[PDB]
Amino acid sequence: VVIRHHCKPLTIAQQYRALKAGGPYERLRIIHHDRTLLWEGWLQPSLFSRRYKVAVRYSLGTPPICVVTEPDLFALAGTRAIPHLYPADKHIPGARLCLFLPRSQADDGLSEWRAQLKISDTLIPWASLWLFYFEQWLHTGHWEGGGKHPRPSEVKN
Amino acid sequence: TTARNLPSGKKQRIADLLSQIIETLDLTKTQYANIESAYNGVGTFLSEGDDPLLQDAVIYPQGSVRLNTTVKPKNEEQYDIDLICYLPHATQADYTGVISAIRQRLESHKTYKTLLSELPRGFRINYAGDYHLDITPGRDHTGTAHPGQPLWVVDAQTAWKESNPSGYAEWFESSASVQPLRTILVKKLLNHIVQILKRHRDEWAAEQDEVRQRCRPISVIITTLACHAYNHIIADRRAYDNDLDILLDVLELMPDFIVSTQGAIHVNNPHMPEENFAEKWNRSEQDEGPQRSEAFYQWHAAAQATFNTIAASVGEDNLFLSLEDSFGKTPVDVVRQRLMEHMQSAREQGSLHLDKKTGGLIATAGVPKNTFY
Numbered sequence A: 001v002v003i004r005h006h007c008k009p010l011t012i013a014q015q016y017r018a019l020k021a022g023g024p025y026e027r028l029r030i031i032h033h034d035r036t037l038l039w040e041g042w043l044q045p046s047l048f049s050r051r052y053k054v055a056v057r058y059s060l061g062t063p064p065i066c067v068v069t070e071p072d073l074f075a076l077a078g079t080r081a082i083p084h085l086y087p088a089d090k091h092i093p094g095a096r097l098c099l100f101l102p103r104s105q106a107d108d109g110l111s112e113w114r115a116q117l118k119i120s121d122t123l124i125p126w127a128s129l130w131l132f133y134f135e136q137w138l139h140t141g142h143w144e145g146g147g148k149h150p151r152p153s154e155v156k157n
Numbered sequence B: 001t002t003a004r005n006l007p008s009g010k011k012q013r014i015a016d017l018l019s020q021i022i023e024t025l026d027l028t029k030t031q032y033a034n035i036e037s038a039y040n041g042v043g044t045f046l047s048e049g050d051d052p053l054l055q056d057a058v059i060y061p062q063g064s065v066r067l068n069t070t071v072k073p074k075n076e077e078q079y080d081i082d083l084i085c086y087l088p089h090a091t092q093a094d095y096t097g098v099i100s101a102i103r104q105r106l107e108s109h110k111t112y113k114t115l116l117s118e119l120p121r122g123f124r125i126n127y128a129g130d131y132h133l134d135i136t137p138g139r140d141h142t143g144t145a146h147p148g149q150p151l152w153v154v155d156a157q158t159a160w161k162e163s164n165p166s167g168y169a170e171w172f173e174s175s176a177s178v179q180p181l182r183t184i185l186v187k188k189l190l191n192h193i194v195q196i197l198k199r200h201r202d203e204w205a206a207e208q209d210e211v212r213q214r215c216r217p218i219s220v221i222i223t224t225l226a227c228h229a230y231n232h233i234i235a236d237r238r239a240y241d242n243d244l245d246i247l248l249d250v251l252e253l254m255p256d257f258i259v260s261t262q263g264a265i266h267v268n269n270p271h272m273p274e275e276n277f278a279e280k281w282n283r284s285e286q287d288e289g290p291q292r293s294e295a296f297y298q299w300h301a302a303a304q305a306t307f308n309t310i311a312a313s314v315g316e317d318n319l320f321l322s323l324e325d326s327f328g329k330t331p332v333d334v335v336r337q338r339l340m341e342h343m344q345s346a347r348e349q350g351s352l353h354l355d356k357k358t359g360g361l362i363a364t365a366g367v368p369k370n371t372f373y
Ligand SMILES: Nc1nc2c(ncn2[C@@H]2O[C@H](COP(=O)(O)OP(=O)(O)OP(=O)(O)O)[C@@H](O)[C@H]2O)c(=O)[nH]1
Pocket: B062, B063, B064, B065, B069, B070, B071, B080, B081, B082, B121, B134, B163, B218, B219, B220
């Protein structure tokens, strides 16, 4: 999107007030001396699918981290390798999820996640969109949907 | 988990999947026009016969093609149509003269020689991988007072049995147009609930043994019993919020409305009570009559038990695992592949929204495109 550059990256408080307008939340803390936002809740993809718990951590200058905490995802993965995963976190357990093409792979300079957009509009429908392709990875053995480029050498990190 | 303790949204979503499978698996109207022009061509080739028994021969349809309850069979590319030719000058004649007359009248045409295989209820003009045509020669019955259609048919055993197709069909076409009462929520219905019970019957025969493969229930004794169960629901004037409890209550009254009287099972016609549609049920050589009363009720138990297995599944991968065993492997894959070519089109068009309180994505607040990597 051709947008103006007058809008700046916005602080903790504006997405602190924005997360309470949508959905049921268990707790929403602020830790590490007014640095790190934390959200967890119950997210369901469809009417007949499972029950999921996601976890959102944000710091300025860093991309946000989505990680599914319950269930463990490796027992229902069936001990085969799950693609579209980042290297995992050392502080909270679970499988980390990918949601965006970052800044270094884009050509216009604007990433798929931007700092102008708030948190609850985009990344939790993208987490539900990751989970809606996660259980249709099963019953066919393929990842039908969005896919990455077949890069010969690049690690995307 | 039972299918009556579910909410209405999951129940009518299951019934929408069943009606989507039946609307896939039926016969389309362009093929109906080709079948209609084809059998009217067979009827005009009968009407130019030089034999006097063949004169004034007219063909009207019968079976499932009159009631719009035709379903593509299991492992079969080709449908089946059945017809009756009525001959008023063959009332004096015997069945061998009319069988040789219809056989010579389709022996005159050479494409009807190269497209023919015989069958005991009548001659079958099968085609190359599209459909079949059947016919049945019949007289008229004289000396009885009826609301409609007095007729005998040709049977291979007793040489003239009886039927009454069009009054029974107009009894179905008068009961089918009546819609029941619906509560206030804060192709007809009887034509569709016959058809999903026929589709459940083919995948029921994929697991049963070879003695129950002969003893699977025949399709016209399922047709007349749900017509009996639909007349009682209209006469009771009850109301229904859902469209799956019109399938479950009709299957519940399905064993109570088959009436055995003086030791012989009678599922008759309302217009002509002489001939028995459950005469196949009634014969007791090698205890076969108890075998088709046992194997109808085993299918009656397993068409309620598998409706609790769809309600017991969690996960969308296990919804299509359970519905694979209801419809076969192939037709659930067409409905599933349509469901995320609509969902991949919803990301580009922006129609996909997500309410945060319910949590679930709804595909008809726009999500950005190209989310994965
Ligand atoms: N026994 C018997 N069954 C009938 C008669 N008329 C229609 N049917 C049944 O109608 C049922 C369902 O309709 P279809 O499956 O379309 O019938 P069909 O496959 O076209 O039957 P055919 O053309 O004879 O092969 C079948 O099970 C037939 O046996 C009849 O006069 N006697």
